[PDB]
Write a protein that binds this ligand. Structure first.
Ligand SMILES: OB(O)c1ccc(C(F)(F)F)s1
Ligand SMILES: OB(O)c1ccc(C(F)(F)F)s1
Ligand SMILES: *[B@@](*)([O])C1=[C][C]=C(C(F)(F)F)S1
Ligand SMILES: [Ca+2]
Ligand SMILES: [Ca+2]
Ligand SMILES: [Ca+2]
Ligand SMILES: [Ca+2]
Ligand SMILES: [Ca+2]
Length: 241
């Protein structure tokens, strides 16, 4: 089952943050590519993730963001002072916010939401995970429909909507070098989010890349090798010691 991972290589480090309802395996191939290029990486795993869907509803985005910060702080404790934060999906929103809470050499956002119909993305993301999990449990279609019909929204999903709006409203405070990556065929979040992030950060050093044959979990999809190369080129451009 997926767990946090720590790939120790050279002195340059990347904190890898996964997506909403995702898990560390979604960023592990990126981690391995980075390791082959000499970069250390650490990937936390958010509380309640990689588990039955009700565990997400017992948790909170405030915890998940702290899980992200704990990964940064762990890299520092392990000797890595120079850290780029690279986040997939909701993790990309956490990467932007983390850069306001900790010192980073740069930021990568990959299919991160910002603006638009946030509530739709939250509920569709959760419900898709929940339905797929119940299928994996071997449940029949009626049992799944019945369990899904008993879904009760919790404070978790309202908190997530509020957290996303907070990050949107503070994105003009982001100053560190940034690469914005977006899949054109993302069916979870609106690809125009990438324009919004790019346009509204204060970062003087920024770039954006679009991927025409990819979806939301871009780091496991069919163009992942090009995504990884583009991330690498961005990393190589930064002000490392
Ligand atoms: O420790 B820190 O820099 C945090 C900033 C926001 C946090 C949350 F708990 F509200 F998510 S913790
Ligand atoms: O609305 B508030 O200022 C928030 C505090 C922490 C947030 C999270 F993004 F970590 F979840 S949002
Ligand atoms: B990527 O895994 C995401 C799916 C739904 C998201 C949110 F609702 F947070 F915007 S992010
Ligand atoms: Ca090695
Ligand atoms: Ca150590
Ligand atoms: Ca039945
Ligand atoms: Ca029904
Ligand atoms: Ca500026």
């Amino acid at each position: 089952l997926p767990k946090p991972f720590f790939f120790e290589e050279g002195k340059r480090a990347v904190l890898l943050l996964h997506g909403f309802t995702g898990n560390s395996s979604d960023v592990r191939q990126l981690g391995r590519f980075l390791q082959k290029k000499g970069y250390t990486s650490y990937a936390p795993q958010y509380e309640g993730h990689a588990a039955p869907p009700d565990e997400i509803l017992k948790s909170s985005p405030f915890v998940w963001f702290k899980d992200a910060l704990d990964g940064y702080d762990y890299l520092v404790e392990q000797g890595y002072d120079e850290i780029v934060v690279a986040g997939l999906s909701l993790g990309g929103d956490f990467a932007l916010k983390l850069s306001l809470n900790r010192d980073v050499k740069g930021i990568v956002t990959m299919c991160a939401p910002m603006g638009g119909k946030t509530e739709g993305a939250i509920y569709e993301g959760f419900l898709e995970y929940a339905r797929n999990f119940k299928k994996y449990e071997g449940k029949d279609q009626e049992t799944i429909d019945n369990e899904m019909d008993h879904f009760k929204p919790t404070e978790t999903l309202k908190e997530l909507s509020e957290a996303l709006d907070t990050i949107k409203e503070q994105v003009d405070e982001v100053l560190d070098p940034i690469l914005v990556i977006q899949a054109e065929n993302d069916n979870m979040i609106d690809p125009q989010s990438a324009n919004y992030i790019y346009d509204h950060v204060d970062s003087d050093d920024k770039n954006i890349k679009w991927y025409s044959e990819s979806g939301h979990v871009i780091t496991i999809d069919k163009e992942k090798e090009q995504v990884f190369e583009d991330i690498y080129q961005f990393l190589e451009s930064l002000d490392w010691s």
